[PDB]
Design an enzyme around this catalytic site. Structure first.
Site, PDB file in Angstrom:
ATOM      1  N   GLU D 150      16.603   0.849  -3.447  1.00 20.14           N
ATOM      2  CA  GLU D 150      16.819   1.104  -4.870  1.00 20.14           C
ATOM      3  C   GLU D 150      16.641  -0.176  -5.657  1.00 20.14           C
ATOM      4  OE1 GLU D 150      16.508   2.740  -7.418  1.00 20.14           O
ATOM      5  OE2 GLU D 150      18.306   3.833  -8.021  1.00 20.14           O
ATOM      6  N   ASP D 151      16.032  -0.081  -6.823  1.00 20.41           N
ATOM      7  CA  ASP D 151      15.764  -1.291  -7.591  1.00 20.41           C
ATOM      8  C   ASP D 151      17.066  -1.912  -8.129  1.00 20.41           C
ATOM      9  OD1 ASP D 151      16.170   0.903  -9.433  1.00 20.41           O
ATOM     10  OD2 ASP D 151      14.351   0.513 -10.523  1.00 20.41           O
ATOM     11  N   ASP D 154      23.700  -0.090 -11.547  1.00 21.95           N
ATOM     12  CA  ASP D 154      24.156  -0.399 -12.895  1.00 21.95           C
ATOM     13  C   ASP D 154      25.481   0.345 -13.007  1.00 21.95           C
ATOM     14  OD1 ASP D 154      24.457  -0.582 -15.759  1.00 21.95           O
ATOM     15  OD2 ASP D 154      22.290  -0.910 -15.883  1.00 21.95           O
ATOM     16  N   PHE D 203      19.901  -5.418 -20.368  1.00 20.64           N
ATOM     17  CA  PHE D 203      18.844  -4.540 -19.888  1.00 20.64           C
ATOM     18  C   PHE D 203      17.654  -5.386 -19.480  1.00 20.64           C
ATOM     19  CE2 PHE D 203      15.629  -1.243 -19.651  1.00 20.64           C
ATOM     20  CZ  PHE D 203      16.352  -0.189 -19.107  1.00 20.64           C
ATOM     21  N   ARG D 216       6.559  -2.519 -16.588  1.00 16.42           N
ATOM     22  CA  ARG D 216       6.639  -2.520 -15.100  1.00 16.42           C
ATOM     23  C   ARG D 216       5.747  -3.572 -14.473  1.00 16.42           C
ATOM     24  NH1 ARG D 216       9.669   2.021 -13.448  1.00 16.42           N
ATOM     25  NH2 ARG D 216       9.324   3.870 -14.777  1.00 16.42           N
TER      26      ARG D 216
HETATM   27  O1  HPA Z   1      18.771  -2.954 -16.738  1.00 20.81           O
HETATM   28  C1  HPA Z   1      18.004  -2.079 -16.299  1.00 20.81           C
HETATM   29  N1  HPA Z   1      16.645  -2.212 -16.469  1.00 20.81           N
HETATM   30  C2  HPA Z   1      15.769  -1.221 -16.049  1.00 20.81           C
HETATM   31  N2  HPA Z   1      16.233  -0.089 -15.447  1.00 20.81           N
HETATM   32  C3  HPA Z   1      17.562   0.073 -15.254  1.00 20.81           C
HETATM   33  N3  HPA Z   1      18.269   1.060 -14.672  1.00 20.81           N
HETATM   34  C4  HPA Z   1      19.571   0.723 -14.734  1.00 20.81           C
HETATM   35  N4  HPA Z   1      19.706  -0.481 -15.351  1.00 20.81           N
HETATM   36  C5  HPA Z   1      18.469  -0.914 -15.682  1.00 20.81           C
HETATM   37 MG   LIG Z   2      13.378   3.376 -15.478  1.00 22.88          MG
END
Ligand code: HPA
Ligand SMILES: [Mg+2]
Ligand code: HPA
Ligand code: HPA
Ligand code: HPA
Ligand SMILES: [Mg+2]
Ligand SMILES: [Mg+2]
Ligand SMILES: [Mg+2]
Ligand SMILES: [Mg+2]
Ligand SMILES: [Mg+2]
Lengths: 228, 228, 233, 234
Positions: D150-151, D154, D203, D216
Site C-alpha cells: 500500500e502506498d 492516513d 497532502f 503521479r
Molecule cells: O496525502 C496523501 N496523498 C495522496 N494520496 C493519499 N491517500 C491518503 N493520503 C494521501
Molecule cells: Mg489517490
C-alpha cells in the site's frame, strides 16, 4: 585458480558472439540526432552491454571469491566498462557480505594512448605512474577492446617492473581482425566483427564516447572527424 | 555567463544544506554488513546524491548551452560524482539535440592526492596527460569535496600555465569547517557538517569507496583503517 | 506535417502507420551462461531470446515514438494486467522523462493511467475465451486511449478487448505492444507501436509467465519442455 | 530470536507486532523546488520536496531486504493496491527479485506471486469514508501467505476495510507493507508490518501518489500547495 598468464586466456569462458550480419538499424533505439548521419548501424545496445557486464562481474567474483584484488582501469576508453563493472561487482560482493567480510577490491587508473583515426599507431604512450603499491598484489586489468592486441602486450610487459603477484585481464570487446597478435583476455564480453566501433566510451578521435550503444562509424563519420 | 573566477563562486546557486543533526540510522538503508561497525550514521543516501547530481547537470547545461567544454575529473575521489554527472549531462544534451547539434563536452582525467587518514598533508601530488591540449578551452573541474580548499587553490594555480579560456568548478560536497580557506565552487551539490565522510567514491585510506551512501566514519573505523 | 494528417492512430487492429518492430530471427539468442539467470530457472529454459537491457532500450524508443505522435495531447494509458506490467512501468518511466525534460512552465501533464485485468491462457495455449475483470471505464468517454499489451499472439485478446471498449464511446483507441509473435494462427490484429517481432515459441520473463511462473526472470527466454511439464496447470 | 523459537511471518494485520520503525520525516524537513529536477509546469503547484525519489528507492531496497529476511524461502503473494501503490510495488518487486535471485541456488524456488486490486476512496485531499473495491477472484489466495503493498496509511480506513473484505477468502496470513504513514490525528491505529517513512499530516503527491489523478508522474514526494488543490479540484 586466479588467472596469471596474461594474453593466454587459459580458462576463459566464451564471449557472446556478435555475428558479421548482426546489429540493428538506427531507428530501433534512441540515437542522439547529430550522430545518426555518421553511423551505419547499432551493433550492441547499451542495455545488453550492461547485462553482459553484470555477468562478467559475477564470473570475476566467482574466481576471486574474497581474495583482495586491484583493478586497473585503462583510460579513457575503459570508463564505461569500468563503471558498470564496479557497480555490479560491488552489489554482488556486498549483497553476499557478512559482518566478518572485508572490501573486495581497490581501484587504480592508468591513461594509455595508441590510436589515431581508426588505426593503431603501433606505439603506446603511458601516464600513471607509481604502480609500486601493486607489488605482491593480484591485479585485474580492465580494458575496453582488444583489436591488434598491441596495447595489452606492451602494457603487460611494462607492468613486470612492479613485481605484481598475478595479472588477469578483463576485456569488454574482442574484434575478429586478421591484425590480431593472439592476445586473449581472461574475462571477455563480446566477440565482434572487423569494423571500427564507437560508443560506450569508445571514441573515434575523441568523438562518440557519450554515445550509449556500440555502433559502427560510417565513412562520412571517419572523414568528418579525421585527425588534422 | 560561463564562470571564470576560480574559487569565487560568483554566481553559484545554493547547495542543498545538510544540517548538523541530519542523517539516518544505519538500519534505514542497505549498508554492506562489514562496514556497519565502522560507521556512525548515513548522512546522504545514494539516491539523493544522484538526484542532486541530475539537477547540477541541468544547471551546467543551462550555463554552457551548446558551447563546447572540457570536463576534468580529479581522481580517484571524483569517480562517482563524475560518472553520474556524465550520465545526466549526456541524457539532457542528447535528448534536446537535433540533426545540426554537436557533442557538448570532452573528458579528461587528473590524479590528484593530498590526504592521509582524515587530514590534508598540506602538499599536493598531481599526475595527468599533458594539459596543453586544454589551451583556449572552457574547462569544468569536477571535484568530490571542498574541505580545507587546499586541493583546488593549488590545482587552479597550476592550471594558470596552460592558457585555458575559462575555469569553472563543480563540487559535490562542501564541508562547513573552520579550516576552509574560502574557495567556493561554481556548481555545488551539498553543504555538510564538519565530520569526515566516506562513501560515494570518498575514502578513508582507500577504504569505503564502494559504499553507496555518504556516511560518517566512526572512531573505531578511523583506528582500524589508520595509515601504518 | 500535423496540419495535413492527424498523427493519433484511430483504426485499432490496422497498425495503419506503425514503424516496423525489431526483427528477432528464429536462430537468434544467447546461451544461459551469457547473462544473469536465477540459478533455479536454468534447468527450465532453452536460451535467452531477448536480453532485459535490449527490451529496456527498445521501450525507451517506443516512448519516444509515442511522444512524437501525441505531442501535447492528453491520452490515457490502459495496462492489460498481469503480463503488461514490465512493459508498462518501463514505458511510463521513459514517457515521463521525455515529456518532462522538454516541458516548459506552460506545459500540462501528458497521460492518465488505468488498469484492467484480462485472462485467456492456460499452459502455453490460449483457451480462446477472454475473462475481463470489469472496471468502470466510462471515465474514458471521449478520450484518446492507448492500450499497453505485453504480447500479440493469436490476436484474440485484443480483438475481444477492443470490442468490449466500444460501449464506453472512447475518442481514439491506439495499441502499443512489446512483442508480436510470428504465429500462423495470428488473426491479423496489428499494433500502432510495436517493440519486437519474435518467432512462434512460448516465451517467459519480463512479466510474461508460464502458469504464473517466470514473471521475475529479467530476460525474455524460451521455456523448455521440462519447464512446461514441471509447471503444467 | 531464531526461527525455531518464533515464526517470523506476521499474522496480525493492523497490529504491526514486530515492525521496524520507519524513517522519520519531520514537519520542517525538505528541500526547495530548485534543489532537484521538477517538471517545469508542476512547480507553481508545489510547496517543497518532502522526500526525494532516490531516498524513496533506497528505502524500498531495505524494505525488500527486511521482507526477504522475514519470509526466507516461503512462497508468498504480493497484492498491489492500485492505482497509488504502482511506484512502490514496482520498486519493491525489482529489489525483492534481485535479493532473492542473487542468493538463489540450483534447488531454490520462486519466492512470490503477484496480484492486483483497484481500491478507491479519496476525493480531493480527503477520504470519503467509503471504499470501492475491484479485482480478480481472490479465492486463489486461499491458504496462502499474503503481503498487501500500500502506498500510504492516513486514516487507516482503506486497510481496515480491505482486510475485513479479505476474510472471506480463507487466506493463511495477511501482512502489510506500506511506503508512507502520515502522522494524522485521524489515524485509527492500523499499523503496517513493514513501513518506509513516517511523514507529517500534509497532502502529498508524487511517486504514484495523486491529487485527483494529477502528479503521479512527479518523481519526488512533494506537498501540493493551495493553488494546486484549487486548480485540480474535482
Ligand atoms: O496525502 C496523501 N496523498 C495522496 N494520496 C493519499 N491517500 C491518503 N493520503 C494521501
Ligand atoms: Mg489517490
Ligand atoms: O574498433 C575500435 N573502436 C574504438 N577504439 C578502438 N581501439 C581498438 N579498436 C577500436
Ligand atoms: O571528509 C572527507 N572524506 C573523504 N575525503 C575528504 N577529503 C576532504 N575531506 C574529506
Ligand atoms: O509466448 C507467450 N508467453 C507468455 N504469455 C503469452 N501470451 C501469449 N503468448 C505468450
Ligand atoms: Mg585503446
Ligand atoms: Mg580511443
Ligand atoms: Mg581529495
Ligand atoms: Mg581520499
Ligand atoms: Mg500469462
Amino acid at each position: 585458480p586466479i588467472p596469471n598468464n596474461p594474453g593466454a586466456g587459459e580458462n576463459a569462458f566464451d564471449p557472446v558472439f556478435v555475428n558479421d550480419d548482426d546489429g540493428y538499424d538506427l531507428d530501433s533505439f534512441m540515437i542522439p540526432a547529430h550522430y545518426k548521419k555518421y553511423l551505419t548501424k547499432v551493433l550492441v545496445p547499451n542495455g545488453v552491454i550492461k547485462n553482459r557486464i553484470e555477468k562478467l562481474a559475477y564470473d570475476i567474483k566467482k574466481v576471486y571469491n574474497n581474495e583482495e584484488f586491484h583493478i586497473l582501469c585503462l583510460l579513457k576508453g575503459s570508463r564505461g566498462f569500468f563503471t558498470a563493472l564496479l557497480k555490479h561487482l560491488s552489489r554482488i560482493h556486498n549483497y553476499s557480505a557478512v559482518e566478518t567480510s572485508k572490501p573486495l577490491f581497490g581501484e587504480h587508473y592508468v591513461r594509455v594512448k595508441s590510436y589515431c583515426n581508426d588505426q593503431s599507431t603501433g606505439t603506446l604512450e603511458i601516464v600513471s605512474e607509481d604502480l609500486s603499491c601493486l607489488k605482491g598484489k593480484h591485479v585485474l586489468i580492465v580494458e575496453d577492446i582488444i583489436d591488434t592486441g598491441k596495447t595489452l602486450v606492451k602494457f603487460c610487459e611494462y607492468l613486470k617492473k612492479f613485481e605484481i603477484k598475478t595479472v588477469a585481464i578483463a576485456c569488454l570487446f574482442i574484434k575478429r581482425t586478421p591484425l590480431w597478435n593472439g592476445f586473449k583476455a581472461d574475462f571477455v564480453g563480446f566477440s565482434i566483427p572487423d569494423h571500427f566501433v564507437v560508443g560506450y566510451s569508445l571514441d573515434y578521435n575523441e568523438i562518440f564516447r557519450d554515445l550509449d550503444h556500440c555502433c559502427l562509424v560510417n565513412d562520412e563519420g571517419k572523414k568528418k572527424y579525421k585527425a588534422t
